[PDB]
Amino acid sequence: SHMYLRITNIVESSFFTKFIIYLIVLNGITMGLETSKTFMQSFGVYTTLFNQIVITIFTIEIILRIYVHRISFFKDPWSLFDFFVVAISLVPTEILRVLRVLRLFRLVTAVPQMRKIVSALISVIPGMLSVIALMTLFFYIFAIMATQLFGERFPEWFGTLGESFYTLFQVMTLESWSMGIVRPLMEVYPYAWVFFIPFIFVVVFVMINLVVAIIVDAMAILNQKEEQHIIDEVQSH
Amino acid sequence: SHMYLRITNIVESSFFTKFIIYLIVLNGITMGLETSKTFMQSFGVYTTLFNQIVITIFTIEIILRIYVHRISFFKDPWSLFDFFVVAISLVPTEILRVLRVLRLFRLVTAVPQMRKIVSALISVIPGMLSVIALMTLFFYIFAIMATQLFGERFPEWFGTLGESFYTLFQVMTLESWSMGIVRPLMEVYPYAWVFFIPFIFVVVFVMINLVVAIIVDAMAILNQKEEQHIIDEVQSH
Amino acid sequence: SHMYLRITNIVESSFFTKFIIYLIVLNGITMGLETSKTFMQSFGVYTTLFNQIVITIFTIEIILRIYVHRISFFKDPWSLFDFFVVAISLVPTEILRVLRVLRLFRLVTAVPQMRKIVSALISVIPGMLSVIALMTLFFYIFAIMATQLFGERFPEWFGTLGESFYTLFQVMTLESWSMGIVRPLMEVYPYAWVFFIPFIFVVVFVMINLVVAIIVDAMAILNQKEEQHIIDEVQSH
Amino acid sequence: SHMYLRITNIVESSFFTKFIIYLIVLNGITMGLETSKTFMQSFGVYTTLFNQIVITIFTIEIILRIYVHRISFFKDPWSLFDFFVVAISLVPTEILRVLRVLRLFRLVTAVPQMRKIVSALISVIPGMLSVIALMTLFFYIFAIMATQLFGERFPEWFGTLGESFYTLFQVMTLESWSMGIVRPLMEVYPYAWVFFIPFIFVVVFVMINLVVAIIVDAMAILNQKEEQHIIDEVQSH
Ligand SMILES: CCCCCCCCCCCCCC(=O)OC[C@H](COP(=O)(O)OCC[N+](C)(C)C)OC(=O)CCCCCCCCCCCCC
Ligand SMILES: CCCCCCCCCCCCCC(=O)OC[C@H](COP(=O)(O)OCC[N+](C)(C)C)OC(=O)CCCCCCCCCCCCC
């Protein structure tokens, strides 16, 4: 309650937060430099210790932040991310070596402007889950159908549920859907177009109508809010 | 009127609807498993009977639902779909074997959240039919023109009205329209671009303007509705 | 003033307009049939005379419509289109043979629902001309630059102002812009990306912002209109 | 203060501005003509002097405009652009020879309608910088990760941070992302899809949600503005 407040003033200080951001930017520059074989041959020794130093400092920081925030730390998504991103970077030296770079997203955690962007962007998602679920069910059914219609003759694209899922996603982005998949398919299965065209219609119609519904429903609420404000004034005056 | 109500309380019960959804999810898992040759070699016998069982249960369910809803059953699109999807799965064991998977969309029929999504999405369509008709006429005219401009020299892409329709749809999605179709066409017909560019302009302009019109007209009605509410208050107070 | 009204009641009659639409649909079916070599071998004789008949009837119709509408006929875009589309089909039997199919768009001229769609869609265009002009100037400048940067070494894609225009349009649709054009270009000109990336940014930013501006400005006017209505009520009550 | 006003009436005159636009259009036509080797063989001599003449006139114009506007000239973006675009064209005769064409954008500087378009389009950008920054950080992190996951085995696409940036941008436009990059990658790295799919989801989700937020926030302000106007009337009457 006394040594506590000492470190709480540190962890909460403007300097503390600025320092950590400084390190994030430095280490971010460093991780781009470590991309050059030339650079690594000359200064790899320096950059590697600086990475260990930065992660040590970040470890101390996370530790301090937990002593200060106590339980609230692990009920906070931004610090949960800081935690797991620094924890990943702690596992001893193979894909984890690459996931270490995710600690640069810490620059989103630390900068309030960036948090508001991400929070704002994330906020459409909860209301989209049922549509996403519906779409995932749609993909699943069509992936099953495509696996068994086309998998024997086109193993790479449809031989497996996973592969059909992948290909169906490719068709959704419209990437080479016709020259690359459906025309080749139609040389064996001339009615393949009866499968993929409707698939393309549904998947594109749903995406567009999802955007239309977000905008139009947003404004419906905007209208409800100003309607109450105007009516209250009328009711009051 | 008495044995009727006995089964009506069953068919209307929370348990009845939950049970059927349970089966849909189980059978949905099962149909993904039947995709693995390995899995089928080991447990194909089990999964096949479970499919026959599920379809038997679904047959009993449809039958019960018709006795309970009487005529209203066949005037209801969700149960019409349940009907035809279960009926398909009833035809004896080849493409129908694959259409059996459509009974997984029954998970949309049974889950009210999913119905509202689909109903919502479908509701733009009635007001789009005339535009869709106009676009289909557009495709038809340009498919006729392309068949006779390019079909002799490019049979695969334009030799037939059907093939030209297909290719025109591909050009609409912009998939390989230039490297894959129009540049090859222009090596024989250097003015082919005078055909496909304007085609691309119209088809893209119409899609975008359709989205713009749905959003803007939706808000026009939103504005009309709150205008009347505010004015009525003014008129009343 | 007397024989005039006789034909005016004809030309204005519900039957007259329905008959012509009937012919348009029939001849539209016919023009799709004439696409099949098989069909032409058997019934080409019949279809060809029916085409001459239909065009004769359409010629009489246009003539009647001009006597009835007088000058107003040539000040009306829908009848101007009917005129030129029937006139094209009148030139004696080579690309004009294919333009004959454009008389099927007459089904848009004759059906009021279709006219409203087309009128509605066309109505955004006048306010877009300056943006279109700006974009065309943009294409022109970049086509000049690309012709002289890349035309010697890549004649097919940039050897000519016209070809560079074509390729630039292809890059705008994002069709094979990188694997098909810019990566090949970068093997000779490693900074080609400094040309096409910014080009892609501008062209995509302008299209999106054009859509955003149409929607948002539409609603600005919608808001101005209901604001005046509400305020007038407040002012009146 | 006296010879000053003499040239100020010139530089501000309707004729002065029209003359310069005339030259811009002429020189714009000329620069398209200089694209034809045939044309240059015959009239290249003429066009080259006309280019030197035009640039001399533009130099005099810029000089006059600076004497008239004094400091205000270099605090004005449109004239700053005129300045640098004419200055580029002044460097003696290699890429600068091509940048000379940028003086045609002077037609945007000189035509007020075009300025309003460009100003309008630019006005969304300041509020987008933080999102753009967030997206650039996103690209940077994923470019680092992709360089080290895939660069050794796929040097052309990922061997270098710059190349990975380029490829990631290509994946964002969805151009050949699967047939051209990720399927080839997956033949060596079967989990490459775990990298690029989520990358595609984020990058597409962010773009769409950025458009949704611009439209919806624009209308929020539109609603706030008319709400105050209506309420003030209610408050006043
Ligand atoms: C509720 C959402 C539903 C969405 C609708 C999507 C479902 C439609 C999928 C049907 C498309 C079939 C595409 C296709 O080509 O499948 C492959 C089969 C293979 O037989 P086939 O092509 O005749 O030749 C085999 C060649 N061989 C001997 C060398 C192997 O080819 C055929 O069997 C061709 C048979 C024509 C199928 C026509 C189906 C019309 C629509 C069916 C669904 C309507 C009820 C919803
Ligand atoms: C107002 C809107 C303006 C929009 C900006 C668009 C204008 C930028 C275009 C510059 C991009 C240049 C792309 C390019 O690779 O051009 C080709 C030249 C060719 O020389 P190079 O690539 O060095 O090698 C030639 C190879 N050889 C000997 C076998 C022929 O390659 C080079 O010369 C490379 C030189 C680097 C150019 C860097 C330009 C930075 C931006 C310049 C414009 C800024 C002022 C607006």
Side-chain angles (χ1 to χ4, degrees), chain A residues 4-5 7-14 16-17 19-36 38-40 42-44 47-48 50-51 53-66 68-69 71-74 76-89 91-93 95-96 98-115 117-223 226-227 229-233, chain B residues 4-5 7-14 16-17 19-36 38-40 42-44 47-48 50-51 53-66 68-69 71-74 76-89 91-93 95-96 98-115 117-223 226-227 229-233, chain C residues 4-5 7-14 16-17 19-36 38-40 42-44 47-48 50-51 53-66 68-69 71-74 76-89 91-93 95-96 98-115 117-223 226-227 229-233, chain D residues 4-5 7-14 16-17 19-36 38-40 42-44 47-48 50-51 53-66 68-69 71-74 76-89 91-93 95-96 98-115 117-223 226-227 229-233:
Chain A
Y4 170 82
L5 292 182
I7 99 165
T8 291
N9 279 247
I10 302 295
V11 168
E12 298 294 313
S13 73
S14 197
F16 190 93
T17 300
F19 182 66
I20 296 301
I21 303 174
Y22 181 67
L23 287 186
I24 299 173
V25 169
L26 253 41
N27 196 211
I29 297 168
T30 254
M31 286 184 153
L33 270 37
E34 292 187 302
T35 278
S36 157
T38 306
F39 176 84
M40 286 291 75
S42 301
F43 318 108
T47 315
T48 307
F50 175 74
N51 287 325
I53 292 190
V54 159
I55 183 185
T56 296
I57 297 191
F58 286 177
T59 303
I60 302 306
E61 171 212 342
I62 298 299
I63 297 178
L64 294 182
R65 286 172 57 191
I66 293 171
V68 169
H69 286 88
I71 220 229
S72 287
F73 177 99
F74 306 92
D76 167 66
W78 311 100
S79 53
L80 287 174
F81 179 90
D82 291 357
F83 183 93
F84 283 104
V85 134
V86 174
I88 291 163
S89 185
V91 173
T93 325
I95 179 179
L96 292 186
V98 176
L99 285 186
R100 289 194 191 339
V101 179
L102 300 183
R103 87 169 79 108
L104 302 192
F105 284 127
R106 210 112 130 56
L107 189 55
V108 179
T109 291
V111 182
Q113 296 83 265
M114 290 317 177
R115 275 196 281 211
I117 311 255
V118 174
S119 285
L121 292 153
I122 294 313
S123 69
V124 294
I125 292 186
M128 291 179 37
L129 298 181
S130 55
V131 175
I132 291 163
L134 170 57
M135 203 72 164
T136 300
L137 173 68
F138 189 73
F139 264 77
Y140 180 66
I141 292 175
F142 269 74
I144 296 182
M145 285 180 72
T147 296
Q148 59 197 20
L149 291 169
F150 311 116
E152 294 299 336
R153 232 68 140 51
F154 295 91
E156 174 191 334
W157 302 333
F158 299 104
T160 245
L161 191 62
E163 280 166 308
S164 300
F165 251 96
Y166 179 90
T167 298
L168 281 179
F169 182 70
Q170 177 192 319
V171 175
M172 174 167 75
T173 69
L174 309 168
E175 199 277 282
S176 310
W177 72 264
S178 173
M179 304 302 284
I181 276 62
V182 177
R183 291 201 188 261
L185 239 53
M186 287 195 290
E187 278 164 346
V188 173
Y189 304 108
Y191 292 108
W193 67 268
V194 176
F195 182 93
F196 291 89
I197 304 300
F199 177 85
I200 290 175
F201 263 79
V202 173
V203 138
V204 168
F205 178 95
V206 166
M207 304 240 76
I208 294 171
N209 282 275
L210 185 44
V211 177
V212 166
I214 296 168
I215 302 173
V216 174
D217 286 0
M219 315 169 273
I221 306 169
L222 292 179
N223 260 22
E226 74 143 75
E227 174 189 42
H229 294 157
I230 296 173
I231 290 187
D232 293 344
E233 294 305 285
Chain B
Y4 170 82
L5 292 182
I7 99 165
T8 291
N9 279 247
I10 302 295
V11 168
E12 298 294 313
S13 73
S14 197
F16 190 93
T17 300
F19 182 66
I20 296 301
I21 303 174
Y22 181 67
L23 287 186
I24 299 173
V25 169
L26 253 41
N27 196 211
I29 297 168
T30 254
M31 286 184 153
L33 270 37
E34 292 187 302
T35 278
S36 157
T38 306
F39 176 84
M40 286 291 75
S42 301
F43 318 108
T47 315
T48 307
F50 175 74
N51 287 325
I53 292 190
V54 159
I55 183 185
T56 296
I57 297 191
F58 286 177
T59 303
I60 302 306
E61 171 212 342
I62 298 299
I63 297 178
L64 294 182
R65 286 172 57 191
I66 293 171
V68 169
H69 286 88
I71 220 229
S72 287
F73 177 99
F74 306 92
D76 167 66
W78 311 100
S79 53
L80 287 174
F81 179 90
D82 291 357
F83 183 93
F84 283 104
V85 134
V86 174
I88 291 163
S89 185
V91 173
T93 325
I95 179 179
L96 292 186
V98 176
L99 285 186
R100 289 194 191 339
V101 179
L102 300 183
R103 87 169 79 108
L104 302 192
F105 284 127
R106 210 112 130 56
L107 189 55
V108 179
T109 291
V111 182
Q113 296 83 265
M114 290 317 177
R115 275 196 281 211
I117 311 255
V118 174
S119 285
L121 292 153
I122 294 313
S123 69
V124 294
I125 292 186
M128 291 179 37
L129 298 181
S130 55
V131 175
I132 291 163
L134 170 57
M135 203 72 164
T136 300
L137 173 68
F138 189 73
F139 264 77
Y140 180 66
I141 292 175
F142 269 74
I144 296 182
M145 285 180 72
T147 296
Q148 59 197 20
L149 291 169
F150 311 116
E152 294 299 336
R153 232 68 140 51
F154 295 91
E156 174 191 334
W157 302 333
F158 299 104
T160 245
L161 191 62
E163 280 166 308
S164 300
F165 251 96
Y166 179 90
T167 298
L168 281 179
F169 182 70
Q170 177 192 319
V171 175
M172 174 167 75
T173 69
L174 309 168
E175 199 277 282
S176 310
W177 72 264
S178 173
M179 304 302 284
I181 276 62
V182 177
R183 291 201 188 261
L185 239 53
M186 287 195 290
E187 278 164 346
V188 173
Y189 304 108
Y191 292 107
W193 67 268
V194 176
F195 182 93
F196 291 89
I197 304 300
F199 177 85
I200 290 175
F201 263 79
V202 173
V203 138
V204 168
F205 178 95
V206 166
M207 304 240 76
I208 294 171
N209 282 275
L210 185 44
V211 177
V212 166
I214 296 168
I215 302 173
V216 174
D217 286 0
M219 315 169 273
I221 306 169
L222 292 179
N223 260 22
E226 74 143 75
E227 174 189 42
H229 294 157
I230 296 173
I231 290 187
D232 293 344
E233 294 305 285
Chain C
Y4 170 82
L5 292 182
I7 99 165
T8 291
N9 279 247
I10 302 295
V11 168
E12 298 294 313
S13 73
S14 197
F16 190 93
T17 300
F19 182 66
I20 296 301
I21 303 174
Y22 181 67
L23 287 186
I24 299 173
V25 169
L26 253 41
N27 196 211
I29 297 168
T30 254
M31 286 184 153
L33 270 37
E34 292 187 302
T35 278
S36 157
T38 306
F39 176 84
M40 286 291 75
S42 301
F43 318 108
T47 315
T48 307
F50 175 74
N51 287 325
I53 292 190
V54 159
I55 183 185
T56 296
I57 297 191
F58 286 177
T59 303
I60 302 306
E61 171 212 342
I62 298 299
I63 297 178
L64 294 182
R65 286 172 57 191
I66 293 171
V68 169
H69 286 88
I71 220 229
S72 287
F73 177 99
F74 306 92
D76 167 66
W78 311 100
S79 53
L80 287 174
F81 179 90
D82 291 357
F83 183 93
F84 283 104
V85 134
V86 174
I88 291 163
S89 185
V91 173
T93 325
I95 179 179
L96 292 186
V98 176
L99 285 186
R100 289 194 191 339
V101 179
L102 300 183
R103 87 169 79 108
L104 302 192
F105 284 127
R106 210 112 130 56
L107 189 55
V108 179
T109 291
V111 182
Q113 296 83 265
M114 290 317 177
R115 275 196 281 211
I117 311 255
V118 174
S119 285
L121 292 153
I122 294 313
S123 69
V124 294
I125 292 186
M128 291 179 37
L129 298 181
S130 55
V131 175
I132 291 163
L134 170 57
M135 203 72 164
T136 300
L137 173 68
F138 189 73
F139 264 77
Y140 180 66
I141 292 175
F142 269 74
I144 296 182
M145 285 180 72
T147 296
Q148 59 197 20
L149 291 169
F150 311 116
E152 294 299 336
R153 232 68 140 51
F154 295 91
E156 174 191 334
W157 302 333
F158 299 104
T160 245
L161 191 62
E163 280 166 308
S164 300
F165 251 96
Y166 179 90
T167 298
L168 281 179
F169 182 70
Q170 177 192 319
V171 175
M172 174 167 75
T173 69
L174 309 168
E175 199 277 282
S176 310
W177 72 264
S178 173
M179 304 302 284
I181 276 62
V182 177
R183 291 201 188 261
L185 239 53
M186 287 195 290
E187 278 164 346
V188 173
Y189 304 108
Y191 292 107
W193 67 268
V194 176
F195 182 93
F196 291 89
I197 304 300
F199 177 85
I200 290 175
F201 263 79
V202 173
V203 138
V204 168
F205 178 95
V206 166
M207 304 240 76
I208 294 171
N209 282 275
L210 185 44
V211 177
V212 166
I214 296 168
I215 302 173
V216 174
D217 286 0
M219 315 169 273
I221 306 169
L222 292 179
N223 260 22
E226 74 143 75
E227 174 189 42
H229 294 157
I230 296 173
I231 290 187
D232 293 344
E233 294 305 285
Chain D
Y4 170 82
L5 292 182
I7 99 165
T8 291
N9 279 247
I10 302 295
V11 168
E12 298 294 313
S13 73
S14 197
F16 190 93
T17 300
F19 182 66
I20 296 301
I21 303 174
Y22 181 67
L23 287 186
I24 299 173
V25 169
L26 253 41
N27 196 211
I29 297 168
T30 254
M31 286 184 153
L33 270 37
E34 292 187 302
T35 278
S36 157
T38 306
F39 176 84
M40 286 291 75
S42 301
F43 318 108
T47 315
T48 307
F50 175 74
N51 287 325
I53 292 190
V54 159
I55 183 185
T56 296
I57 297 191
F58 286 177
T59 303
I60 302 306
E61 171 212 342
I62 298 299
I63 297 178
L64 294 182
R65 286 172 57 191
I66 293 171
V68 169
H69 286 88
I71 220 229
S72 287
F73 177 99
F74 306 92
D76 167 66
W78 311 100
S79 53
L80 287 174
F81 179 90
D82 291 357
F83 183 93
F84 283 104
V85 134
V86 174
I88 291 163
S89 185
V91 173
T93 325
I95 179 179
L96 292 186
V98 176
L99 285 186
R100 289 194 191 339
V101 179
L102 300 183
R103 87 169 79 108
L104 302 192
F105 284 127
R106 210 112 130 56
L107 189 55
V108 179
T109 291
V111 182
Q113 296 83 265
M114 290 317 177
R115 275 196 281 211
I117 311 255
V118 174
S119 285
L121 292 153
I122 294 313
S123 69
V124 294
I125 292 186
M128 291 179 37
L129 298 181
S130 55
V131 175
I132 291 163
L134 170 57
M135 203 72 164
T136 300
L137 173 68
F138 189 73
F139 264 77
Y140 180 66
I141 292 175
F142 269 74
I144 296 182
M145 285 180 72
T147 296
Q148 59 197 20
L149 291 169
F150 311 116
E152 294 299 336
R153 232 68 140 51
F154 295 91
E156 174 191 334
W157 302 333
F158 299 104
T160 245
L161 191 62
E163 280 166 308
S164 300
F165 251 96
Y166 179 90
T167 298
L168 281 179
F169 182 70
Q170 177 192 319
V171 175
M172 174 167 75
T173 69
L174 309 168
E175 199 277 282
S176 310
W177 72 264
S178 173
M179 304 302 284
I181 276 62
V182 177
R183 291 201 188 261
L185 239 53
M186 287 195 290
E187 278 164 346
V188 173
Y189 304 108
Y191 292 108
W193 67 268
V194 176
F195 182 93
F196 291 89
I197 304 300
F199 177 85
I200 290 175
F201 263 79
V202 173
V203 138
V204 168
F205 178 95
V206 166
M207 304 240 76
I208 294 171
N209 282 275
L210 185 44
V211 177
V212 166
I214 296 168
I215 302 173
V216 174
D217 286 0
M219 315 169 273
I221 306 169
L222 292 179
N223 260 22
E226 74 143 75
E227 174 189 42
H229 294 157
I230 296 173
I231 290 187
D232 293 344
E233 294 305 285

